[PDB]
Design a protein around this ligand. Structure first.
Ligand SMILES: *[C@@H]1O[C@H](CO[C@@H]2O[C@@H](C)[C@@H](O)[C@@H](O)[C@@H]2O)[C@@H](O[C@@H]2O[C@H](CO)[C@@H](O)[C@H](O)[C@H]2NC(C)=O)[C@H](O)[C@H]1NC(C)=O
Ligand SMILES: *[C@@H]1O[C@H](CO)[C@@H](O[C@@H]2O[C@H](CO)[C@@H](O)[C@H](O)[C@H]2NC(C)=O)[C@H](O)[C@H]1NC(C)=O
Ligand SMILES: *[C@@H]1O[C@H](CO)[C@@H](O[C@@H]2O[C@H](CO)[C@@H](O)[C@H](O)[C@H]2NC(C)=O)[C@H](O)[C@H]1NC(C)=O
Ligand SMILES: *[C@@H]1O[C@H](CO)[C@@H](O[C@@H]2O[C@H](CO)[C@@H](O)[C@H](O)[C@H]2NC(C)=O)[C@H](O)[C@H]1NC(C)=O
Ligand SMILES: *[C@@H]1O[C@H](CO)[C@@H](O)[C@H](O)[C@H]1NC(C)=O
Ligand SMILES: *[C@@H]1O[C@H](CO)[C@@H](O)[C@H](O)[C@H]1NC(C)=O
Lengths: 685, 684
């Protein structure tokens, strides 16, 4: 039989590690050629293959190529080549002799151009055949923002450049486009600073252990992130430093490897007539002496590819081996025509040709704490992403998919604490309006054992207004059933200040008049002077009314919100919580509140100093002022301690409110209690 | 006869991305006829040339390489035209033991000897724009240089070598950006990073676009020096391109004043080489043999490199002079030819032709500058001798080279002048009057108008006000006396002294009115003579415990405030940062507020008691009206002048003026009121 010659360019040596690849792929192709010798498949020729050692050095490969061209017979196609440079230069030079190169290990996307390489074909899935796969995987669980991490080599940067070209048009966001060279730790720093949910790594094998070792230190793992890593490393890759397996193993879950699949996924009859299981058994029992490569499927397939191509060209040959030198190109054009439309089913599946490439099967996998178990497939010919449920696992219950999602709420107060204070609300007010009737009982049953007829009424008015203000203080703050009540904060603070100045004016003008009659020399007993004392209290009352309209004018004191941000999580869900507190002030009224508190302090320390003096002045013209100094000291300390604890709080809006309620229900009834507790006891002997 | 035809393979791209073969082929024909015309160069042999076109296409080039290599006869030296074909042949020349000679390969990656051991090129690589660039940086000492490049291998392979060459010169490269065809965003980043000197690496068709963009952002001008390549045409900013909306003279204003670093192509002199020719006869012979025009052909500028490219290998083979029997298997002939080619050093049409250890030939770079619409030479350079020649035609903005941005720290001046001296002379008059009156009071202590009992507290107030008038001066200025930079020491000394002095004086002032109010409300003991005075003195001495507690945990600090904006100056690009100083502490604001509140507490207690005991009579009866009026003055003075020295920092006419007016008016007026009724009515 006349031979049809073909040439294989394979590493056959024992020095170069690609010699293992050539020694692994030679049994599949000799099995294919002996099966083609078994069947007819031809008329009446037989195929012959001539091996040529390359070692994928460029000079040695080109020299062996020249030797094969000069010394071999009239070859028709050319076959093989594993290292990308020695494939690329021959595929560029291929258009001279008008031949066709079929590869099975060319895994570089730079062979995608047909203006560069119009005569080149390959059956191995390239590195660009993972980018629609990762798009379908991201769209299967509805991801938008993803973070990439690429080592600065030309292949990884090329697949990063085509990543944007494949994701152009969909709901995808690219936030952290970090591209390091040898410092991945600052890359994990920048990625955690941009807190991206999904890592899209692109690096080689030796960088990966360092990446996981100094990503353990930042703790960029857990039930919050996924890791899409090219998993074409060797099995048990993690053994290759200074780190430890405790700081390596706890970051490799949710670790997704995106490879090309060697065989099919069925026990189906192929173009050989056999099944992949029987083919795999015959392959591993053909030689029994070589560690099995991951390319012998495509190696077995390509022989049937070129045999079907020449079988599809033999009828156009009959329309005319015996009429082809290396110079002819029309016959090679017919070879291109019969080769480009190749479409049949083989061991890798239904092979196609969309501009020099076949849509392969992408095998997703996951390191499930002992090994990378296969978890899912995808066929770009049909664009369907199969998955194997009840096999993938997660350290979380739900598969994390965790963007940084936030939530906010108001700061609430403790209601079993607030409710007993709301029960203490009423008693002081009813006691106030009843002791007012005891004073009108002094009016209705006249025996004036005290001061002016309006004075203890002014004390009771200050106590009632304070007990109304301290009640409607926190019912508007925390309980937000009345929502626009932070505007009513201004409508209650004037009530509180008027009650304060009324109570302390009735405390102060009386004691000042006792001082004014104590430091005299002859006599002082007038009722019109007591009228002057009451209008003297009214003068600072109207001064505080002018201060009230000055408070209206200095700021609106509208509803402001302090957003207190610490973001914890109580039950593991990534929906974080950040509380917020209502603040009534406008943060530039510090001068305003400072001058108001200084006004109150200057009006308040007068009686506190004067109580040191008048402690022995037992004046019977007013029939009072023996326990009023003991009252004014024991309220002057509590008002400043309430102001001090109030300004030293609102870090927790519960403790401040219960303590100002405590001091308010202390003072606003301890004045009435210490002004009346020997009074009615001696009037009811 | 005896004419052994030695054959040499070659390659000439007639068209394609680099049409050098239109010009190099008559050049190598002239050079081969020239080495044929001399028997000194050809003792026994004769050089012949076989060649093929390649269009700078490696696909045709590999086929033609096989066609010449595996045919007959045996060739020795190869000649690739373009760059990629040169890389392809120099990668694979090692398996035949051949030596290759290029003439146009500007690839900076071709300097490696591991992948390419047997390769030389007469055309210098692109990395020899960098030593002249770093010498032009060394001439003017600039340190902050920014780089922008087109994303291309021939520029990214240049800029990293520029980095690892400039790092030995101590010049940092701050902003290293890149783009492909969008010039807007990198010049946006350069404007936002506001660098001074900018180096660019890009071709002409995007050079026009990036210069339209830099005209639009207004980043040309005074403090901007642009370094570019120089193999553009002399008309390159003038041809109409509708790809950009910038106008032609607006482009011309934008490209004004930038430095270009070309490379030589021929002898700058008019000497004669070993080839025994000059430049003009060579150009005439090229115009004779070239049927095209030199203005329209390609590779005409690199065409003089082909002549000495032939001549160097011709002199090397003549130096070897056992040569006509070369085969690819052996290596001794190859090593002999390599050794002869290693020591090549002579004078050719491109000047001195010496190879380096890697394989490149060094040359000169004619450094020029666009000076008003036309190119003009600045000077020359050679890397192997550092002979930076010059001609002094570089115009500038004002003559000087603008440099990187600097800064001047300007210290915020005080007014230590006659305004300070009026304060000091009023302080001196107060000091003399106070100490003289205190000595007169001590020297009246036998018997007087006011008797011996009362005014020893008044003597202690005189001592305290004298200490205040002694602590008023050393608050300093912006460094004006013998010895400075001990500002925390002098501030803590002045502060401690003024604190103890005011505490003593005001305490012994206030205790008298406290005790006259006490004897007014006692309804004459003075129980022990130093009882009241000693207990108010311990009330004063409580304050030195506060001073010591202020000294223990945070005594001192000399801070610097930078209250104004840099560069208010109008003509020089040196930013003026005015910085001031006030002696301070770690956290002193709340501390001084607390101390002001404490002293205000005592002062308001005094001002209320002064209105309290306004009308009384005791044994020390002739004191209370004047003591109360002095209290009424000192209280309103200290309270009206505490905030304007607390919150102010502009000390020119406000802070120190108000504070000094307060303290010296206080001590002056209180003493000149408190001693009027005593000595005038003692001798009245
Ligand atoms: C190099 O070439 C020159 C060419 O000189 C020209 O042609 C000559 C005929 C003569 O007319 C010169 O003036 C022209 O410029 C050769 O030049 C002269 O050769 C003569 C020989 O006797 C000698 O006396 C002159 O000095 C030469 N003049 C110059 C300027 O070189 C010269 O001989 C050639 N040299 C070699 C080594 O070949
Ligand atoms: C070369 O390959 C292309 C890509 O498959 C072929 O285009 C297809 O042709 C078939 C018919 O043979 C059509 O049914 C498909 O729809 C075409 N593809 C597309 C994307 O439209 C082309 O026909 C092939 N040429 C030859 C000569 O075989
Ligand atoms: C070319 O080579 C020849 C020898 O093959 C050289 O000829 C001799 O060179 C020496 C050099 O010192 C001279 O001293 C002799 O006078 C030369 N003899 C002859 C007969 O020429 C020749 O010099 C070489 N050409 C060069 C170097 O240009
Ligand atoms: C020329 O070839 C020599 C081969 O030896 C190259 O190496 C130099 O060798 C000499 C001794 O022969 C040493 O003294 C030098 O130190 C070597 N060079 C270096 C850089 O170490 C040499 O580099 C080649 N080139 C030149 C221009 O001499
Ligand atoms: C797993 O997926 C297969 C796919 O068809 C489906 O039939 C099966 O019901 C799924 N099982 C569970 C538990 O989701
Ligand atoms: C800038 O130039 C473009 C053409 O390159 C033109 O379309 C655009 O209108 C111009 N911008 C103007 C005139 O503002």
């Amino acid at each position: 039989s006349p031979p049809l010659s073909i040439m294989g360019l394979m590493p056959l040596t024992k020095e170069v590690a690609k010699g293992s690849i050539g020694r692994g792929v030679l049994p599949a192709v000799e099995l294919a050629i002996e099966q083609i010798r078994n069947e007819s498949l031809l008329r009446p020729y037989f195929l012959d293959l001539r091996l040529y050692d390359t070692e994928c050095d460029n000079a040695k490969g080109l020299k062996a190529f020249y030797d094969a061209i000069k010394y071999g017979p009239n070859h028709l196609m050319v076959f093989g080549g594993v290292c990308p440079s020695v494939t690329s230069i021959i595929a560029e030079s291929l258009q001279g002799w008008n031949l066709v190169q079929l590869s099975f290990a060319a895994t570089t996307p730079v062979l995608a151009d047909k203006k560069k390489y119009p005569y080149f074909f390959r059956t191995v899935p390239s590195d660009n055949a993972v980018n629609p796969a990762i798009l379908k995987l991201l769209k299967h669980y509805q991801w938008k923002r993803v973070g990439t991490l690429t080592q600065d080599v030309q292949r990884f940067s090329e697949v990063r450049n085509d990543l944007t070209g494949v994701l152009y048009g969909e709901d995808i966001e690219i936030s952290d486009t970090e591209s390091f060279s040898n410092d991945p730790c600052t890359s994990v720093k920048k990625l955690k600073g941009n807190d991206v949910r999904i890592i899209l790594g692109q690096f080689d094998q030796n960088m990966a252990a360092k990446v996981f070792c100094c990503a353990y230190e930042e703790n960029m793992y857990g039930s919050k992130y996924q890791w899409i890593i090219p998993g074409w490393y060797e099995p048990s890759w993690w053994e290759q430093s200074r780190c430890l397996r405790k700081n390596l193993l706890a970051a490799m879950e949710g670790y997704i490897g995106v490879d090309f699949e060697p065989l099919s996924s069925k026990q189906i009859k192929t173009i050989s007539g056999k099944t992949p299981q029987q083919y795999e058994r015959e392959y591993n029992n053909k030689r029994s002496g070589v560690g099995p490569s991951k390319f012998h499927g495509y190696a077995y397939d390509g022989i049937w590819v070129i045999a079907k191509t020449l079988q599809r060209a033999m009828e156009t040959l009959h329309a005319s081996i015996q009429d082809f030198n290396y110079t002819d190109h029309t016959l090679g054009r017919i070879i291109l025509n019969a080769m480009n439309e190749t479409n049949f089913f083989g061991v890798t599946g239904q092979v196609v040709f969309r501009n020099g490439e076949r849509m392969g099967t992408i095998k997703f996998t996951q390191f499930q704490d002992s090994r990378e178990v296969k978890v899912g497939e995808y066929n770009a010919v049909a664009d369907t992403l199969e998955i194997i449920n009840d096999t993938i696992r997660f350290q979380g219950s739900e598969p994390p998919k965790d963007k940084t999602i936030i939530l906010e709420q108001l700061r609430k107060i403790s209601l079993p604490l607030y409710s007993i204070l709301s029960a203490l609300t009423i008693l002081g007010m009813i006691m106030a309006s009843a002791f007012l009737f005891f004073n009108i009982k002094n009016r209705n049953q006249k025996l004036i054992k005290m001061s002016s007829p309006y004075m203890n009424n002014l004390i009771i008015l200050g106590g009632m207004l304070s007990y109304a203000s301290i009640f409607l203080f926190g019912l508007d703050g925390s309980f937000v059933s009345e929502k626009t009540f932070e505007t009513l904060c201004t409508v209650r603070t004037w009530i509180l200040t008027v009650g304060y100045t009324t109570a302390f004016g009735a405390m102060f003008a009386k004691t000042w008049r006792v001082h004014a009659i104590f430091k005299n020399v002859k006599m002082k007993k007038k009722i019109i002077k007591d009228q002057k004392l009451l209008v003297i209290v009214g003068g600072m009352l109207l001064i505080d009314l002018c201060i009230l309209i000055c408070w209206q004018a200095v700021d609106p004191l509208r509803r402001t919100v302090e957003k207190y941000s610490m973001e914890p999580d109580p039950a593991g869900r990534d929906i974080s919580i950040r509380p917020l507190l209502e603040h009534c002030e406008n943060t530039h009224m510090t001068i305003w509140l400072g001058i108001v508190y200084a006004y109150k302090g200057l009006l308040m320390l007068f009686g506190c100093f004067l109580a040191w003096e008048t402690r022995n002045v037992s004046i019977p013209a007013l029939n009072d002022s023996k326990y009023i100094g003991m009252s004014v000291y024991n309220v002057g300390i509590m008002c400043i301690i309430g102001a001090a604890v109030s300004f030293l709080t609102r870090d927790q809006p519960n403790v401040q409110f219960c303590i100002v309620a405590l001091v308010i229900i202390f003072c606003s009834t301890i004045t009435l209690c210490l002004v009346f507790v020997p009074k009615l006891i001696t009037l009811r002997t | 006869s005896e004419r052994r035809a030695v054959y040499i393979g070659a390659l000439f791209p007639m068209s394609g991305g680099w049409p050098g073969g239109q010009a190099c082929q008559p050049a190598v024909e002239m050079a081969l006829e020239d080495v044929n015309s001399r028997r000194d160069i050809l003792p026994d042999y004769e050089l012949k040339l076989i060649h093929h076109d390649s269009k700078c296409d490696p696909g045709q080039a590999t086929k033609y390489l096989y066609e010449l290599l595996y045919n007959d006869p045996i060739k020795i030296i190869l000649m690739p035209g373009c760059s990629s074909v040169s890389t392809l042949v120099a990668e694979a020349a090692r398996m035949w033991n051949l030596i290759v000679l290029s003439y146009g390969s500007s690839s900076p990656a071709l300097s490696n000897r591991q992948r390419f051991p047997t390769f030389f090129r007469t055309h210098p690589s692109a990395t020899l724009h960098n030593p002249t660039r770093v010498k032009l940086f060394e001439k003017w000492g600039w340190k902050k240089i920014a780089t922008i490049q087109q994303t291309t291998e021939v520029f990214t392979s240049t800029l990293d070598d520029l980095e690892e060459r400039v790092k030995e010169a101590g010049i940092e490269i701050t902003f290293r950006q890149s783009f492909f065809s969008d010039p807007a965003v990198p010049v946006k980043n350069l404007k936002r990073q506001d660098a001074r000197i900018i180096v660019g690496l890009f071709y002409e068709t995007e050079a026009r676009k990036v210069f339209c963009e830099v005209y639009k952002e207004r980043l040309f001008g005074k403090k901007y020096v642009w370094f570019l390549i120089g193999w553009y045409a002399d008309n390159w900013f003038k041809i109409y391109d509708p790809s950009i909306n910038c106008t032609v003279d607006e482009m011309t204003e934008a490209v004004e004043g930038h430095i270009t670093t070309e490379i030589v192509m021929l002898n700058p002199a008019n000497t004669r080489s070993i080839s025994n020719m000059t430049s003009q006869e060579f150009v005439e012979k090229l115009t004779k043999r070239l049927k095209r025009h030199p203005e329209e052909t390609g590779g005409f500028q690199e065409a003089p490199l082909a002549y000495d490219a032939i001549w160097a290998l011709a002199l090397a083979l003549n130096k070897t002079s056992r040569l006509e029997d070369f085969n690819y298997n052996n290596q001794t002939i190859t090593d002999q030819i390599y050794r002869a080619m290693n020591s090549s050093s002579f004078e050719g049409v491109s000047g001195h032709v010496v190879f380096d250890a890697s394989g490149s030939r060094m040359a000169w770079t004619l450094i020029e500058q666009l000076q008003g619409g036309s190119y003009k030479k600045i000077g020359y350079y050679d890397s192997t001798k550092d002979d930076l020649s010059w001609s002094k035609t570089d115009k500038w903005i004002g003559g000087s080279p603008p440099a990187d941005q600097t800064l001047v720290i300007k210290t915020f001046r005080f007014l230590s002048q006659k305004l300070f001296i009026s304060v000091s002379v009023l302080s001196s008059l107060g000091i003399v009057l106070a100490v003289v009156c205190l000595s007169f009071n001590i020297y009246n202590s036998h018997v007087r108008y006011i008797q011996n009992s009362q005014p020893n507290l008044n003597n202690l107030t005189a001592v305290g006000c004298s200490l205040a008038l002694a602590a008023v001066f050393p608050l300093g200025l912006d460094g004006y006396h013998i010895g400075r930079n001990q500002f925390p020491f002098v501030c803590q000394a002045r502060l401690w002294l003024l604190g103890l002095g005011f505490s003593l004086g005001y305490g012994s002032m206030f205790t008298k009115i406290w005790w006259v109010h006490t004897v007014f409300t006692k309804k004459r003991k003075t129980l022990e003579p130093w009882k009241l005075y000693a207990t108010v003195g311990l009330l004063v001495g409580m304050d030195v415990l506060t001073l010591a507690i202020w000294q223990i945990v945070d005594p001192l600090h000399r801070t610097i405030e930078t209250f104004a904006k840099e560069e208010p100056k109008e003509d020089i690009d040196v930013s003026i940062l005015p910085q001031l100083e006030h002696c301070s502490s770690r956290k002193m604001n709340t501390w001084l507020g607390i101390f002001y509140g404490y002293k205000g507490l005592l002062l308001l207690l005094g001002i209320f008691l002064a209105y309290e005991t306004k009308s009384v009579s005791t044994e020390k009866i002739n004191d209370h009206r004047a003591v109360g009026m002095a209290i009424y003055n000192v209280a309103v003075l200290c309270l009206i002048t505490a905030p304007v020295t607390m919150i102010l920092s502009s000390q020119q006419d406000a802070a120190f003026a108000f504070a000094s007016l307060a303290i010296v008016f206080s001590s002056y007026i209180t003493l000149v009121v408190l001693f009027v009724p005593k000595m005038r009515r003692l001798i009245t």
